[PDB]
Write a protein that binds this DNA or RNA. Structure first.
Ligand SMILES: [Mg+2]
Ligand SMILES: [Mg+2]
Length: 821
RNA sequence: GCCCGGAUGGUGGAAUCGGUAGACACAAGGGAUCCCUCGGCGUUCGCGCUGUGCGGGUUCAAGUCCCGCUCCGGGUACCA
């Protein structure tokens, strides 16, 4: 019989074994079913799950289990972003090498994920550090090279690097943000600003005693009459020409290479092409040599950086834009930034921003000293690292100096895993023999740098669709069946790195014919951070010592606010509130400890209950114990119910009004929970609705056969509704209730419309807008019947005593407001 | 600087379409693991006044819609 006591330790590993043995969450490309691809950002194998992993993957798993119960064919994959820096650190610190360390972390973390009962298709599990994964990005990289999308260049970080031409897709990456209605605006705005398409004008100046011109780039050509000096990047040819005869500038250039406004007068004078005036050219620290032309016309009255530099160096500050209210601006403190009507600008006075922009661009073009120009903040993607633990770059240099891709017959370029790290140099660099190779029987040197680990995370989501496919990077039929990802769950912190790279890589894959869609993921859900209480004491040395909130001993006033805290050693603690988890504040909570203390189901439930998915969640032991206690109550109710044996069939027509009202609450809950999980994604309020119903069901009668049949229906519905959140307990309870088959394949409950119909309705009676009663009336009562009933309420009548009803507002079956005077 | 979120009890937060504010849970307390009570003030226990950051507006009716303000949280920029 059913155990009386709920014991996660006797239930969770058994259900988990069942899921592995039956391969419950393994899926194929079944065209007779509607697909749903639920994806969570894959973990780095650091060694132990953190609470953010737990939140992220619980959200994914709730969604994946729900969509299955709706009858979809659901892919939920997991894997390991396994290359990267931290393994080198650890290898050196320990007796070891990056690979064994990494494989150990995977085993450990994998067992943690299974202990949490995330329903992954384990047969699609990938580790990005294996040659079976990385060979394909090696081959893809050679293809990109052949398409003209990859090149070598020396650059600052200064060293040679391999670049992929992400700028060749800048406009698509920008325009397609408008297809991403189910991405958060914050993420979209971050990518927009990162790409930074800029519409401006290049303007060329003649410079005295300089046998060249100087070209600047501006987005505010409308301010050109306020240009009081030019500034050039430290690395600009003009600055380097002047430094020939200028120690000060020479010194300044050198400092900038290494490295608050700073500059050196170049001594050169440029001629403003419209005013004829001579203006000074400075070399300045705020001017990036790599963007636009490496030079700007400075307009200190209207650019804040130009303002600060001009004040510091005594340069003229000229106003040429009116304030919003039409008034000449106050530039005594700072730049007037806003676009406005021109003054102090000759023939352009009175023009607004757009008119002035175009009039001045037009003029300078006609004069042949300017032209419209679009620039982009986006730079090409440097994918080269001088680091051991990553996929080797499949390029080779022939003795004659020809750089070319590694022949297809030498892919993959295997990174050797059995190495000894000396801590300062890559083993594949330190050994001069590794780079030696042959290409067409001519000696060749193979590349020794490895890929940026963003390389692996940029396409893993697609490889999951066909992870054992050996004929290519993607099996396109499989990929096009699963893709695009339906929901991608992970942090907002990846907004302009990975979240941009994976869109870009998707498009590269489409354009290699490998997929037939434009965007990799339809919905992006960024889960909020998990916070914990933070405490510290000040030692006798004046140093703050942070004390884990587990170890804090708190005391509270009679309304429960923390008023004093100590640690065991008796130090006085300062409470800093809820903060981001961190080693430095020492407030990290170990998910493994809570799983072992309360069971996975308690942890999962708490995490989904405590806060909306996209808001920060405040971890509280209090809350977790609450969720645990709720599970015991569910267990208890089902224990009591099943003790009493089978149930007769529910007779829906013969139910009492109290029975009808409970049954209506069951089905209204089904509908609210369905809407909340599936449309609104408010998982907290879904769980709240289940708790609310469970409270009612614990108070319902359970003697009569009808009461028991009603309870059976309710419990079969509650357990299914709980299942995506707490599936171990729900799997087991489902059997105890004698539900049909495994709960993982049971259909999501659907609300019975007949069960939800009401025989009465509550009407809120107001008098001049103030609630004076709430009356229950027949569901189809007429407005005059409702009125009559409201006047019979003494609570209302006593506000109708000796006053006149001027009018009435009535919302059928909801509200009657009697307006009186 | 600009991009957001947000501001409702002692706490975390609900309120979807303007119409019973505070669901659900924690902390309380205090009763016999279950039952109840729980925004404030008063209460004849039926309710009355008051109440969603501040100030106005719209409306029979505002947490919800518009107009200011004050305060908070988190991103993010020498890209001209
Ligand atoms: Mg010249
Ligand atoms: Mg408050």
């Amino acid at each position: 019989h059913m155990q009386e006591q709920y014991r996660p330790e006797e239930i969770e590993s058994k259900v988990q074994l069942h899921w592995d043995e039956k391969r419950t969450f393994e899926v194929t490309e079944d065209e007779s079913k509607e697909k749903y691809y639920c994806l969570s950002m894959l973990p780095y194998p650091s060694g132990r799950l953190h609470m953010g992993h737990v939140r992220n993957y619980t959200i994914g798993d709730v969604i994946a289990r729900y969509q299955r119960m709706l009858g979809k064919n659901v892919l939920q994959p997991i894997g390991w972003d396994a290359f990267g820096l931290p393994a080198e650190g650890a290898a050196v610190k320990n007796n070891t090498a990056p690979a064994p360390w990494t494989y150990d972390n995977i085993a450990y973390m994998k067992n943690q994920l299974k202990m949490l009962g995330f329903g992954y298709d384990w047969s699609r599990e990938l580790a990005t550090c294996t040659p079976e994964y990385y060979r394909w990005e090696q081959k893809f990289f050679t293809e990109l090279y052949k398409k003209g999308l990859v090149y070598k260049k020396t650059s600052a970080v200064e060293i040679p690097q391999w670049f992929i031409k992400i700028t060749a897709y800048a406009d698509e990456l920008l325009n397609d943000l408008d297809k991403l209605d189910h991405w958060p605006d914050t993420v979209k705005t971050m990518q927009r600003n990162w790409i930074g398409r800029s519409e401006g004008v290049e303007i060329t100046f003649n410079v005295n005693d300089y046998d060249n011109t100087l070209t600047v780039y501006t987005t505010r050509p409308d301010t050109f009459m306020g240009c009081t000096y030019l500034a050039v990047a430290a690395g600009h040819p003009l600055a380097q020409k002047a430094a020939e005869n200028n120690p000060e500038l020479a010194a300044f250039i050198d400092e900038c290479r290494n490295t608050e406004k700073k500059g050196v007068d170049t001594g050169f004078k440029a001629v403003h092409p419209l005013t004829g005036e001579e203006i000074p050219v400075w070399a300045a620290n705020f001017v990036l040599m790599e963007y636009g032309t490496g030079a700007v016309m400075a307009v200190p009255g209207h650019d804040q950086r130009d303002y600060e530099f001009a004040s510091k160096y005594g340069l003229n500050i000229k106003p040429v834009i009116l304030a919003a209210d039409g008034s000449e601006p106050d530039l005594s403190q700072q730049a007037l930034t806003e676009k406005g009507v021109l003054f102090n600008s000759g023939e352009f006075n009175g023009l607004d921003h757009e008119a002035a922009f175009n009039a001045i661009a037009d003029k300078l073009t006609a004069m042949g000293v300017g032209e419209r120009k679009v620039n982009y903040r986006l730079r090409d993607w440097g994918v080269s690292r001088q680091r051991y633990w990553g996929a080797p770059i499949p390029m080779v240099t022939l003795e004659d100096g020809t750089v070319m891709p590694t022949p297809d017959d030498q892919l993959p370029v295997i990174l050797p895993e059995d190495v000894v790290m000396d801590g300062i140099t890559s083993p594949i660099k330190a050994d001069p023999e590794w780079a030696k190779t042959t290409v067409n029987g001519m000696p060749a040197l193979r590349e020794t740098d490895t890929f940026d680990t963003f390389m692996e995370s940029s396409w893993y989501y697609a490889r999951y669709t066909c992870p054992q496919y050996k004929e290519g990077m993607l099996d396109s039929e499989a990929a096009n069946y699963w893709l695009p990802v339906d929901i991608y769950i992970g942090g907002i912190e990846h907004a302009i790195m990975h979240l941009l790279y994976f869109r870009f890589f998707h498009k590269l894959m489409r354009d290699a014919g490998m997929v037939n869609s434009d965007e990799p993921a339809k919905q992006l859900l960024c889960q909020g951070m998990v916070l914990a209480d933070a405490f510290y004491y000040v030692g006798e040395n004046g140093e703050r010592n942070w004390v884990s909130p587990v170890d804090a001993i708190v005391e509270r006033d009679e309304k429960g606010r923390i008023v004093k805290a100590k640690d065991a050693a008796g130090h006085e603690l300062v409470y800093t509130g809820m903060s981001k988890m961190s080693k430095s504040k020492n407030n990290g909570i170990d998910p493994q400890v809570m799983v072992e203390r309360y069971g996975a189901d308690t942890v999962r439930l708490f995490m989904m209950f405590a806060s909306p998915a996209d808001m920060t969640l405040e971890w509280q032991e209090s809350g977790v114990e609450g969720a645990n206690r709720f599970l015991k109550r569910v267990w208890k109710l089902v224990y009591e119910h099943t003790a009493k044996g089978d149930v007769a069939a529910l007779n829906v027509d013969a139910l009492t009004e109290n029975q009808k009202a409970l049954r209506r609450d069951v089905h209204k809950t089904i509908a609210k929970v369905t809407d909340d999980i599936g449309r609104r994604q408010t998982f907290n309020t879904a769980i709240a609705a289940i708790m609310e119903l469970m409270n009612k069901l614990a108070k319902a009668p359970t003697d009569g056969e009808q009461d028991r049949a009603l309870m059976q229906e309710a419990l079969l519905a509650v357990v299914r509704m709980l299942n995506p959140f707490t599936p171990h307990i729900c799997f087991t309870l489902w059997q105890e209730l004698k539900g049909e088959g495994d709960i993982d394949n049971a259909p999501w409950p659907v609300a019975d419309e007949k069960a939800m119909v009401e025989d009465s309705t509550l009407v809120v009676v107001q008098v001049n807008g103030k609630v004076r009663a709430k009356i229950t009336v027949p569901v189809d009562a007429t407005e005059e019947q409702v009125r009559e009933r409201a006047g019979q309420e003494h609570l209302v009548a006593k506000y109708l005593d000796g006053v006149t009803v001027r009018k009435v507002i009535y919302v059928p079956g909801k509200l009657l407001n009697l307006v009186v005077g």
